[PDB]
Structures are given as structure tokens and as C-alpha cells.
Design a protein around this ligand. Structure first.
Ligand SMILES: Cc1ncsc1-c1ccc(CNC(=O)[C@@H]2C[C@@H](O)CN2C(=O)[C@@H](NC(=O)C2CC2)C(C)(C)C)cc1
Lengths: 104, 141, 87
């Protein structure tokens, strides 16, 4: 079963899908092909939780009925610069303006 | 042109609404006039009596947005095999993002206020030109 | 796999499959691997990308199609974007 994800770090957002049966580490390989940083320089998160490499995306709560094409689930991403990992930082998207009066 | 054939050969059909919309079934009568039929709430079905060669289409009852039936615009009851009904599976189309946005904007803005929206005249026209069965019959011809 | 980068007015960089971005003839023209959108803020462009995924997934499919969700607060901007992008 496919799960549909946004992998987010700072102001970077990757839209991609993966198998529910695929692993955290395999998702780092996906990130590696796109952003050119190896798995050992990546940390992946669900909310604040650090994800273990050997776990399936399914085991970590990314299921096909919650990580949907039109409402994908977010996987946080942190990089290691030199010796130590940065903290997890996800820049929020911009705020919609107020509803015009005629839409209220 | 687009009209039911007066065949008089019964065909039993299941209208199965697999959309989240309230569905208006529309029968095209023998002169091509759209005749509305009772609505189906989301997820509900009705076993109905129709006829071979009759033409039907299906709309959102509140907005007239287009819906698909067995993945296409028109449904024509066929011969029943082994006394089994023909299934008419009614679903949402994959609307373009533009059409879906127009639907949502139409659902929040009274038609008198379309002009107060801060958009290009062509989008005001797109809002005012809401879905309508007559429009599509001309199109489908 | 081939990706392209779509950049919002506020600097958010959205990385999506090339095939997905070609849903839009406008984006195709702008590419023919990064495009900047000076008028499309991230709360709109993120949704545009979600639409691509939705469309590619559910086009020519038998499985029941869910409604594509659009919050009232973004509908007007999303409409303008969809009109520009022709999608
Ligand atoms: C209960 C219901 N809910 C949603 S639709 C619906 C419903 C309600 C009633 C019916 C009864 N069937 C009809 O009216 C069929 C459908 C369509 O084929 C036209 N029709 C006819 O019986 C038509 N009759 C014929 O063609 C007879 C000459 C054979 C007339 C009476 C409308 C001229 C069918 C569907």
C-alpha cells in the first residue's frame, strides 16, 4: 500500500510516496537521491519522535488511510553539519489572509 | 439528437451513489427534455425501473456539478442478463483544480457578490457560468 | 526519478515529480529544473502540489474518488493560481 508524504526540513518540502512496508532507512535513500546527503547525515521524525532506520513507515504510523494523496503526512528531516545534528526546524507555510467580507 | 428511445423493453437498474454529493438523476425524455427524478443522499442506492435505450445523467442536486456514472457522462440501461439488474455506479469526477475552486467559491459567495471579488473579469464570468444541464446537452451534441 | 523544484513567493521550495508538475501546461512552458512563483505563497503552492498527487493517483482509476478538500480561507488564492497554471 502506498503512503503519500511531505518530507520537510527548514523551507524544503519533498512530495513523494512510499510503501507502507518500506523502511525509514529506505526513505533516507530516497531523500539522498533528491538532496544529495547520505542517510548517516539524516534524521527523520514523526512529530518530535526520532525514527529508527529498521522500522517500517507503517510501524511508525504512516498508513495508507492517513497519508493520503490529497492530505499527505509529514516526515520531519534534520541534517548533520560536520560532527553534530542540527535541531529539527520546519518553517511553517504562510498564513492565509482574512476571508473577504463576501465570503463570510 | 440526444434523447431516449421509446423501446418499452424493461430494464431494472441500481443507481448507486458512491459520491459524497446529493445526486439528482436526470432522464432525457423522448423529445430530449431533461426530466429530474428524486434525489439520492450520499452513499445510498435505489433499485429503479427504466427501459433499454433510455438515457440518464447525474448531477449534484444542489449545485448541478457534473458527476460520472460508470466512469462516463451518460448511462443507457442495457439488457438484463439472468434477471440481474444493471449497476449504475455514480462517482465524483477528478475535477480540474480550477473547477473545484470555482465550486468552493460558489458555495461561499452569493451570486450577487461575485462581482465584489478581487479577481479578473474572466473568473467572474467563470463563477457566473455555473454548471447547468442544458449547457452540457448542447456540449454533448 | 526526475524531480523539479517549485518555489513559492515566500521562499518555500517544493520538490515534486517532474511528471506531476507537467499537470500544468504553464509550468511545462516555464521549464521548457526550478521555477519561481512570485505571486503564489506557500499555503497555496503546497495545496497545488497536493492536487498533482491527487490527480495522478485518481485519474483513470476504479477505486472510489474522494473529494479534493479546499479550506474556505485559501479558495480564492488557489483559484487564481489554478487559472494561471491552467490545472
Ligand atoms: C425512486 C427513485 N429515486 C431516484 S430515481 C427514482 C425513480 C423513481 C421512479 C421510477 C419509475 N421509472 C420511470 O419513470 C422510468 C424511468 C425512465 O426510463 C422513464 N420511465 C418511465 O416509466 C417512462 N415509461 C416508459 O418509457 C414506458 C413506455 C415504456 C415514462 C412513464 C416516464 C414515460 C424510476 C426511478
Amino acid at each position: 500500500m502506498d503512503v503519500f508524504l511531505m518530507i520537510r526540513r527548514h523551507k524544503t518540502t519533498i512530495f513523494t510516496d512510499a510503501k507502507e512496508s518500506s523502511t525509514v532507512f529506505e526513505l533516507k535513500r530516497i531523500v539522498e537521491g533528491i538532496l544529495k546527503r547520505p542517510p548517516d547525515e539524516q534524521r527523520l521524525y514523526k512529530d518530535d519522535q526520532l525514527l529508527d532506520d529498521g522500522k517500517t513507515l507503517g510501524e511508525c504510523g504512516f498508513t495508507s488511510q492517513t497519508a493520503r494523496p490529497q492530505a499527505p503526512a509529514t516526515v520531519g528531516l534534520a541534517f548533520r553539519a560536520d560532527d553534530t545534528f542540527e535541531a529539527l526546524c520546519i518553517e511553517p507555510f504562510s498564513s492565509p489572509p482574512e476571508l473577504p467580507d463576501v465570503m463570510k | 439528437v440526444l434523447r431516449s428511445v421509446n423501446s418499452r423493453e424493461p430494464s431494472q437498474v441500481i443507481f448507486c451513489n458512491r459520491s459524497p454529493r446529493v445526486v439528482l438523476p436526470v432522464w432525457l425524455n423522448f423529445d430530449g427534455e431533461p426530466q429530474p427524478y428524486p434525489t439520492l443522499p450520499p452513499g445510498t442506492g435505489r433499485r429503479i425501473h427504466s427501459y433499454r435505450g433510455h438515457l440518464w445523467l447525474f448531477r449534484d442536486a444542489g449545485t448541478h456539478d457534473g458527476l460520472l456514472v460508470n466512469q462516463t457522462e451518460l448511462f443507457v440501461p442495457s439488457l438484463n442478463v439472468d434477471g440481474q439488474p444493471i449497476f449504475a455506479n455514480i462517482t465524483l469526477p477528478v475535477y480540474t483544480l480550477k473547477e473545484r475552486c470555482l465550486q468552493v467559491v460558489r458555495s461561499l459567495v452569493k451570486p450577487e457578490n461575485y462581482r465584489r471579488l478581487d479577481i479578473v473579469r474572466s473568473l467572474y464570468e467563470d463563477l457566473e457560468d455555473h454548471p447547468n444541464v442544458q449547457k452540457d446537452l448542447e456540449r454533448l451534441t | 526519478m526526475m524531480y523539479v523544484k517549485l518555489i513559492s513567493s515566500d521562499g518555500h521550495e517544493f520538490i515534486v515529480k517532474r511528471e506531476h508538475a507537467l499537470t500544468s501546461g504553464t509550468i511545462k512552458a516555464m521549464l521548457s529544473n526550478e521555477v519561481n512563483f512570485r505571486e503564489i505563497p506557500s499555503h497555496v503552492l503546497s495545496k497545488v502540489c497536493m492536487y498533482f498527487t491527487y490527480k495522478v493517483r485518481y485519474t483513470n482509476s476504479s477505486t472510489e474518488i474522494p473529494e479534493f478538500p479546499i479550506a474556505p480561507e485559501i479558495a480564492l488564492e488557489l483559484l487564481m493560481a489554478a487559472n494561471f497554471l491552467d490545472c
